[PDB]
Paper text:
Here, we report a functional and structural analysis of YggS from Fusobacterium nucleatum (FnYggS). FnYggS consists of 8 β-strands and 10 α-helices and forms a TIM barrel fold typical of the type III fold of PLP-dependent enzymes.
To better understand the properties underlying PLP recognition, we determined the crystal structure of FnYggS at 2.08 Å resolution by Se-SAD. The crystal structure belonged to the monoclinic space group P21 with a = 37.929 Å, b = 146.375 Å, c = 74.128 Å, α = γ = 90° and β = 93.355°. The electron density map showed a clear electron density for all of the amino acid residues from Met1 to Lys223 in the A chain and C chain, while in the B chain of FnYggS, most amino acid residues from Met1 to Lys223 showed a clear electron density, except for Glu128-Gln132. Instead, a sulfate ion was observed in the PLP-binding site of FnYggS. Interestingly, the position of the sulfate ion in FnYggS-SeMet was almost the same as that of the phosphate group of PLP in the EcYggS structure. This result indicates that the sulfate ion in FnYggS-SeMet is positioned to provide the binding moiety, as is the phosphate group in PLP. During structural refinement, the side chain of SeMet200 showed two distinct conformations.
Numbering used by the authors: 1 to 223
């Protein structure tokens, strides 16, 4: 196995499958990786790392600070309101903004640090009852209050499809999120939504074809 060659294969897939390869970022899902393996990922020339537990990313952030390594940290898991304080100063993008109360806490902590936190709105497109993401109706109801949080920068949307081998279902899920982004860009965001965070190790080639700009790939990189 070779981390470099795994990364290189994914970048080829991006060129092959994306309707706009220049927009697509690889998010290495490092949630099960040691700092040694993460360092090997950085040595490929990539440096976007996504984590999903606050305590874990907290400790990895400090580690790579002390080793003076440059990383763009993404938070891609469930973010409890009272844990925002631990990542607000070092995470570059929060993918999982699923409700107004969380957006309001992120905004409040960002303003206290005199910064604007980039976020994605997490949307439950397939409608599971292990739901955390927005329904579209809930998001529409929240929109103006979200757009008035001046220390948030809402740059896109995110979904997680259920695991399946049915390509028709995956395309339905990924295309529906894209339709939502396009609609939100006409009605509310003046085309300022640029990002679509969708796709994981077992389906990212489909996600790329449906316009993903962040693929969250762990297994394919590290195993």
């Amino acid at each position: 196995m070779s981390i470099k060659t795994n990364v290189e294969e994914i970048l080829e897939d991006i060129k092959k499958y994306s309707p706009y390869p220049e927009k697509v970022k690889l998010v290495a899902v490092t949630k099960y990786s040691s700092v040694e393996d993460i360092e090997k990922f950085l040595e490929t020339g990539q440096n976007i790392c996504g984590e999903n537990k606050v305590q874990v990313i907290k400790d990895k952030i400090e580690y790579f600070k002390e080793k003076n390594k440059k990383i763009k940290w993404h938070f891609i898991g469930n973010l409890q309101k009272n844990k925002v304080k631990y990542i607000i100063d070092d995470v570059d993008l929060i993918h999982s903004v699923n409700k107004l109360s969380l957006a309001q806490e992120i905004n409040k902590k960002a303003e206290q640090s005199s910064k604007i936190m980039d976020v994605l709105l997490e949307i439950n497109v397939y409608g599971e009852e292990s739901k955390q993401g927005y329904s579209l109706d809930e998001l529409k109801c929240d929109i103006i209050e979200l757009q008035n949080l001046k220390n948030l920068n809402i740059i896109g949307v995110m979904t997680m499809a259920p695991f399946t081998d049915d390509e028709k279902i995956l395309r339905m899920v990924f295309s529906e999120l894209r339709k939502i982004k396009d609609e939100l860009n006409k009605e509310y965001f003046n085309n300022n939504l640029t990002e679509l965070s969708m796709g994981m190790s077992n389906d990212y080639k489909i996600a790329l074809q449906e316009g993903s700009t962040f693929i969250r790939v762990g297994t394919k990189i590290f195993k």
